[PDB]
Amino acid sequence: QLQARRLDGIDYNPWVEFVKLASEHDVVNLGQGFPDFPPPDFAVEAFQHAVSGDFMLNQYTKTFGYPPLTKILASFFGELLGQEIDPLRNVLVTVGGYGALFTAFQALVDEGDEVIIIEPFFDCYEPMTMMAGGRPVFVSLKPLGSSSNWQLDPMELAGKFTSRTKALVLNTPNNPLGKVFSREELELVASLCQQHDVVCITDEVYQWMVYDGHQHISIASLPGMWERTLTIGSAGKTFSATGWKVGWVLGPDHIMKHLRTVHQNSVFHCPTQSQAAVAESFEREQLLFRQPSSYFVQFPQAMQRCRDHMIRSLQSVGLKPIIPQGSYFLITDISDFKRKMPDLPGAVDEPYDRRFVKWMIKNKGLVAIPVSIFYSVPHQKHFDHYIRFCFVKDEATLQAMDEKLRKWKVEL
Amino acid sequence: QLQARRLDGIDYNPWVEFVKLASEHDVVNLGQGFPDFPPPDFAVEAFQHAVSGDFMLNQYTKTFGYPPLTKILASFFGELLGQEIDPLRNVLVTVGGYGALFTAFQALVDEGDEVIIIEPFFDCYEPMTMMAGGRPVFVSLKPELGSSSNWQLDPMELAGKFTSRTKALVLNTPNNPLGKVFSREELELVASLCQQHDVVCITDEVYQWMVYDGHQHISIASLPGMWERTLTIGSAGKTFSATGWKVGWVLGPDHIMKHLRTVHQNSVFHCPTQSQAAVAESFEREQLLFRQPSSYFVQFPQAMQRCRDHMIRSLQSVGLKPIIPQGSYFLITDISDFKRKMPDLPGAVDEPYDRRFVKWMIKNKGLVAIPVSIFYSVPHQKHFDHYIRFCFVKDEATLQAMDEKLRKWKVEL
Numbered sequence: 001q002l003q004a005r006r007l008d009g010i011d012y013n014p015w016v017e018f019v020k021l022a023s024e025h026d027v028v029n030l031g032q033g034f035p036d037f038p039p040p041d042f043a044v045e046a047f048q049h050a051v052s053g054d055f056m057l058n059q060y061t062k063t064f065g066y067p068p069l070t071k072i073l074a075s076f077f078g079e080l081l082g083q084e085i086d087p088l089r090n091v092l093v094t095v096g097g098y099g100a101l102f103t104a105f106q107a108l109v110d111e112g113d114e115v116i117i118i119e120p121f122f123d124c125y126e127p128m129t130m131m132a133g134g135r136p137v138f139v140s141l142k143p144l145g146s147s148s149n150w151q152l153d154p155m156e157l158a159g160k161f162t163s164r165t166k167a168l169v170l171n172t173p174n175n176p177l178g179k180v181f182s183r184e185e186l187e188l189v190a191s192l193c194q195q196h197d198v199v200c201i202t203d204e205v206y207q208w209m210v211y212d213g214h215q216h217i218s219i220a221s222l223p224g225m226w227e228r229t230l231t232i233g234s235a236g237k238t239f240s241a242t243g244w245k246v247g248w249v250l251g252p253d254h255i256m257k258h259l260r261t262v263h264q265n266s267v268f269h270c271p272t273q274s275q276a277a278v279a280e281s282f283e284r285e286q287l288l289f290r291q292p293s294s295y296f297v298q299f300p301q302a303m304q305r306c307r308d309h310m311i312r313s314l315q316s317v318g319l320k321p322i323i324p325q326g327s328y329f330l331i332t333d334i335s336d337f338k339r340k341m342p343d344l345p346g347a348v349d350e351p352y353d354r355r356f357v358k359w360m361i362k363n364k365g366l367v368a369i370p371v372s373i374f375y376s377v378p379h380q381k382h383f384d385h386y387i388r389f390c391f392v393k394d395e396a397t398l399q400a401m402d403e404k405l406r407k408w409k410v411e412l
Numbered sequence: 413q414l415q416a417r418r419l420d421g422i423d424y425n426p427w428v429e430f431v432k433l434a435s436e437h438d439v440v441n442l443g444q445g446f447p448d449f450p451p452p453d454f455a456v457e458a459f460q461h462a463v464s465g466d467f468m469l470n471q472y473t474k475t476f477g478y479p480p481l482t483k484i485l486a487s488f489f490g491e492l493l494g495q496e497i498d499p500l501r502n503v504l505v506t507v508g509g510y511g512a513l514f515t516a517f518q519a520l521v522d523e524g525d526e527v528i529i530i531e532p533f534f535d536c537y538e539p540m541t542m543m544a545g546g547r548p549v550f551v552s553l554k555p556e557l558g559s560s561s562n563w564q565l566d567p568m569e570l571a572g573k574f575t576s577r578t579k580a581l582v583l584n585t586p587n588n589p590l591g592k593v594f595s596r597e598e599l600e601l602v603a604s605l606c607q608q609h610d611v612v613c614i615t616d617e618v619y620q621w622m623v624y625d626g627h628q629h630i631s632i633a634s635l636p637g638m639w640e641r642t643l644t645i646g647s648a649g650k651t652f653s654a655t656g657w658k659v660g661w662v663l664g665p666d667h668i669m670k671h672l673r674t675v676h677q678n679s680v681f682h683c684p685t686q687s688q689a690a691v692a693e694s695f696e697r698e699q700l701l702f703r704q705p706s707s708y709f710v711q712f713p714q715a716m717q718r719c720r721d722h723m724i725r726s727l728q729s730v731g732l733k734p735i736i737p738q739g740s741y742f743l744i745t746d747i748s749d750f751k752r753k754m755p756d757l758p759g760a761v762d763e764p765y766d767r768r769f770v771k772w773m774i775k776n777k778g779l780v781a782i783p784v785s786i787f788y789s790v791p792h793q794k795h796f797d798h799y800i801r802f803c804f805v806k807d808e809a810t811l812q813a814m815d816e817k818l819r820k821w822k823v824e825l
Binding site for chain 2 (some may be wrong): 003006011095236258267270273
């Protein structure tokens with residue numbers, strides 16, 4: 001056959017059928033995982049400055065990152081992690097958090113290695129593991145309810161580790177659930193990674209999107225964890241500018257050198273001007289750190305109000321929200337719908353949630369993402385009764401949501 | 413071990429130390445493969461427009477490309493290639509030409525596959541082949557001032573490189589570092605063999621517009637029967653003199669491209685939105701002016717041909733022997749006279765002469781060039797150790813500075 005075997009089973013696209021169906025109807029799109037409003041002025045202005053400034057910013061920068069950006073990432077995140085971070089040795093700028101994840105998997109995961117993935121998982125973790133020859137090993141969080149009460153059972157997790165475990169992928173705050181892992185939960189993960197000599201790949205893109213007094217804790221800051229952790233961030237998720245596609249990985253040289261090898265043999269450079277914009281945007285937030293005018297203070301407070309609005313609204317039609325402590329997202333249990341309306345049309349073994357989302361788009365004008373997309377196939381039948389909404393939305397979008405909900409109840 | 417076996421032998425990269433030594437001396441840098449002057453006004457303005465326009469351009473766009481960009485790529489390159497290109501099935505936007513290459517290799521090259529690479533080659537072709545489990549197989553171009561056109565792709569040598577295990581051949585035209593623009597006859601040779609053996613041609617055409625002396629860029633995908641077995645790669649940075657934009661693309665038939673889309677979906681997922689909008693606007697501008705005297709694709713290569721000619725004249729003043737290129741940003745000079753007269757430059761054992769010569773030239777003459785041996789397979793480096801690569805796509809002030817270094821060197825001869 002023409003194509004490489006590493007592509008086996010990973011062409012499957014869960015997204016396309018729903019975006020197409022959405023495009024066909026008059027919908028309020030709560031499935032999109034990006035803000036439908038502008039980034040803050042200082043971020044937009046930062047990009048404007050980069051594309052009008054020194055003309056040489058139109059040319060290549062350094063392979064492992066634009067130096068002013070790697071300098072500020074090393075300083076700012078070194079303080080947060082309680083670690084001395086060397087920009088040249090410990091920081092790599094990537095094409096978003098996606099590119100960072102891909103670079104980590106391609107550097108470290110080999111044929112036969114196992115990778116522990118925590119369900120529900122950001123969906124790419126599984127096919128990226130597969131493409132690198134790894135065998136995904138799944139552990140499921142155990143389910144108004146709160147994302148904090150979804151438990152990572154210590155015995156179940158410990159039982160997943162074997163001599164073949166290469167890495168565990170931690171995502172906190174979690175997409176799609178919105179769970180913010182506690183210190184105790186991270187100490188559990190850390191203990192097992194140290195016991196078994198496993199690398200923790202930690203996807204922290206939603207670091208700043210935390211609510212209700214919950215604190216983001218970085219596992220790399222725990223005793224002994226810096227030397228076995230890769231920490232990933234996203235400028236897009238940080239500054240509400242998802243189309244910038246700038247991310248980074250932070251970690252120790254003995255691991256990062258391998259990510260550098262992948263990087264130099266794949267993209268070689270990241271774009272120069274967006275990196276300058278991200279550096280300037282961090283400079284702004286560093287200067288205003290913990291102050292009332294800062295984005296990292298103001299924005300999660302605003303989005304918490306959007307969250308609360310959406311929680312109230314969706315209950316009005318019998319959806320049961322699970323209150324998230326972080327991220328852009330909340331999930332709603334649709335079990336009551338499955339009980340009252342079990343026989344929705346769909347394909348063989350098509351989980352109920354996927355059929356429900358299609359029904360909801362066509363009949364009610366609301367888009368959500370079926371949560372079964374974030375589960376291993378063998379677990380989708382059990383975890384078939386949740387859907388993911390995004391509340392990081394313009395106030396006009398939330399008003400339009402409420403209009404659809406009026407129609408759902410009153411025209412029913 | 414911690415790291416994946418696919419990284420074996422590819423952690424060595426020449427570039428980080430070449431930028432290092434140059435940065436540390438007072439020098440005219442002719443080793444850098446990008447312009448040291450601005451992109452044209454319409455391109456800079458296009459990016460300014462993208463970052464000051466529709467606020468939603470700050471958010472994700474479509475996975476396989478910003479639709480206005482895939483639209484203009486499909487219509488403009490469709491015309492150039494004589495092909496009906498579907499933007500959704502035949503175009504993928506990538507992170508530069510580098511990302512395009514990477515995507516192609518990861519989609520198609522598998523353990524045990526052979527990939528034919530033509531020396532001198534843009535250096536990443538080898539490690540990207542190896543990371544994908546492939547076995548690089550090398551064919552060497554065979555070397556008045558010489559001309560890049562006269563470096564021959566021997567038909568019998570090339571034919572003998574094809575086997576039942578050949579998956580792909582990597583064609584780069586115009587070639588970096590040599591500046592060779594492949595002729596119709598040479599492309600017909602490659603095409604014949606790819607059809608005979610059922611091989612995919614991965615064609616790196618980033619320097620498409622940088623052609624001189626009336627030489628025509630011909631795309632192998634335009635030849636009979638080749639669209640169905642060719643991936644064609646371009647780079648916005650090399651097209652619009654904006655290397656830091658890092659936007660590229662692949663063009664090809666759906667039955668191959670679907671596999672590149674799989675790699676893309678499982679790696680970066682999106683390319684940045686706003687630079688894609690800038691590239692789309694820039695191509696729209698050039699398509700509207702296509703073949704007209706005010707177009708960048710007419711004006712710019714004419715301007716850079718003058719810079720090329722200036723450099724050819726100047727470098728001869730110190731005894732370097734240029735090979736006249738028909739395209740690209742680059743020329744190479746033969747340094748065999750220096751090797752003969754000054755053989756004993758310091759260096760490691762088995763360090764190729766060109767690498768030693770470049771270090772000596774940087775420190776003592778104030779000029780940076782790139783040793784051409786980095787564009788050869790390791791077993792051939794000892795035999796192709798007497799060329800260095802210069803970049804002439806440079807501001808007038810830089811070429812003036814070059815001449816000031818050369819005049820001092822000449823007195824020191």
